[PDB]
């Protein structure tokens, strides 16, 4: 059993919880779902559609957490569908290598490696301490 990912995208392309669309700037759209890394509303980036999807989130108090969709046999098991790897407090290079290895070198999603690394870098730069100027 498998409901088509193309069918799911057609249903949720314009109406779903994680889409933030606004008529400003000619109708911009943003995707906020946890298992999407690009941040834009597209079928190739929608993790609710793609069987194999990746996502990067901030981790408390530091580091990032990589969310990946497991084997499609867990499609009807949402509790077993998502695997979360909390990257420890490692250097930026170590984090990039770990993400690149777990995403691209394993054949999972070779096209999302650059996006995942960039998002991880942005999260780390956001988590860095603030040198307040008084």
């Amino acid at each position: 059993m498998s409901v088509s990912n193309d069918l799911i995208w057609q249903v949720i392309r314009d109406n779903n919880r994680f889409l933030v669309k606004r008529p400003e700037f000619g109708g911009i759209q943003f995707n906020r779902e946890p298992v999407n890394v690009s941040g834009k509303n597209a079928q190739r980036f929608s993790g609710l559609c793609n069987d194999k999807a990746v996502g990067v989130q901030a981790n408390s108090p530091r580091g990032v957490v990589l969310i990946t969709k497991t084997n499609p046999k867990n499609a009807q098991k949402p509790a077993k569908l998502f695997r979360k790897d909390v990257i420890a407090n490692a250097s930026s290079r170590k984090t990039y290598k770990s993400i690149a290895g777990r995403i691209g070198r394993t054949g999972y999603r070779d096209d999302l490696v650059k996006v995942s690394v960039a998002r991880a870098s942005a999260i780390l730069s956001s988590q860095r301490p603030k040198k307040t100027v008084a």
Binding site: I8, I12, L48, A79
Partner: protein, 260 residues
């Protein structure tokens, strides 16, 4: 509808030309503010509105029974897709399985505490928390017309036998309980949006086959009813396009982008 006599309960006639006044009818007599004022016009204060609303306006809309069953079947099928539930906003990230079926002992529940405990154990209580947090006062004048509060929709419990499950689950905010034999589209696709979180009982899930039947078999509880046939056998167009049967016969891929 407005009153039939609204705007007509005055005695007024037009004064004609030569009085340096608009030819709209005016109230006769004297000794009061209403005297000499215009009436009977949609542009006049305390007059008659343009095209007064009638009660015999068509309020109800008829739908073919086959179309209604098609919509209900699509809503039930959509409820079994985990991505659609997340799309509709149901917090079902940590629930064990979609569709979610519980034991028939739930139908014999007697307390809201038991119902809440079951929801927390099957990880469905996050929807209840979402509904409780989302409860807010309505924006606009609907709060003056017995519609003060608005909130989100929670899980839809479907049962076969009522032994206390309805009373146990009814007080939980956002939770709607319905019998399997009378599934409602307004609850299965609230707001016209598919992907409602539904919790079935064992008996209700087992009776779903007899309620809807199949494409080739007739439904036991719906006479001469068959499930609709789809116009596409496999809706994975990307797989069909990238399959060997097509890629082996297509011409040169061509340039996806051409330099200026």
């Amino acid at each position: 509808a407005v009153s039939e006599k609204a705007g007509h309960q005055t005695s007024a006639e037009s004064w004609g030309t030569g009085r340096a006044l608009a030819r709209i009818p005016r109230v006769g007599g004297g000794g009061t503010h209403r005297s000499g004022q215009a009436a009977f016009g949609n542009m006049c204060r305390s007059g008659r509105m343009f095209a007064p609303t009638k009660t015999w306006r068509k309020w109800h809309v008829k739908v073919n029974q086959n179309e209604k069953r098609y919509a209900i079947s699509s809503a039930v099928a959509a409820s079994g897709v985990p991505s659609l539930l997340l799309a509709r906003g149901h917090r079902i990230e940590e629930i064990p399985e979609v569709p979610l079926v519980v034991d028939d002992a739930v139908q014999s529940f007697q307390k809201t505490k038991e119902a809440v405990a079951l929801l927390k154990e099957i990880k469905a209580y996050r929807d209840v928390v979402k509904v409780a947090n989302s409860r807010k006062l309505r924006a606009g004048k609907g709060k003056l017309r017995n519609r003060r509060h608005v909130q989100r929709r929670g899980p839809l419990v479907v049962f076969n036998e009522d032994a206390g499950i309805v009373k146990a689950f009814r007080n939980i905010p956002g939770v709607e309980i319905v019998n399997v034999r009378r599934l409602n589209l307004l609850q299965l696709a609230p707001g016209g949006h598919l992907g409602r979180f539904v919790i079935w009982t064992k008996s209700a899930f087992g009776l779903l086959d007899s309620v809807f039947g199949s494409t080739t078999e007739a439904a036991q509880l719906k006479k001469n009813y068959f499930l609709p046939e789809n116009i596409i056998s496999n809706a994975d167009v990307t797989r069909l396009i990238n399959s060997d049967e097509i890629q082996s016969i297509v011409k040169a891929a061509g340039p996806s982008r051409v330099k200026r």
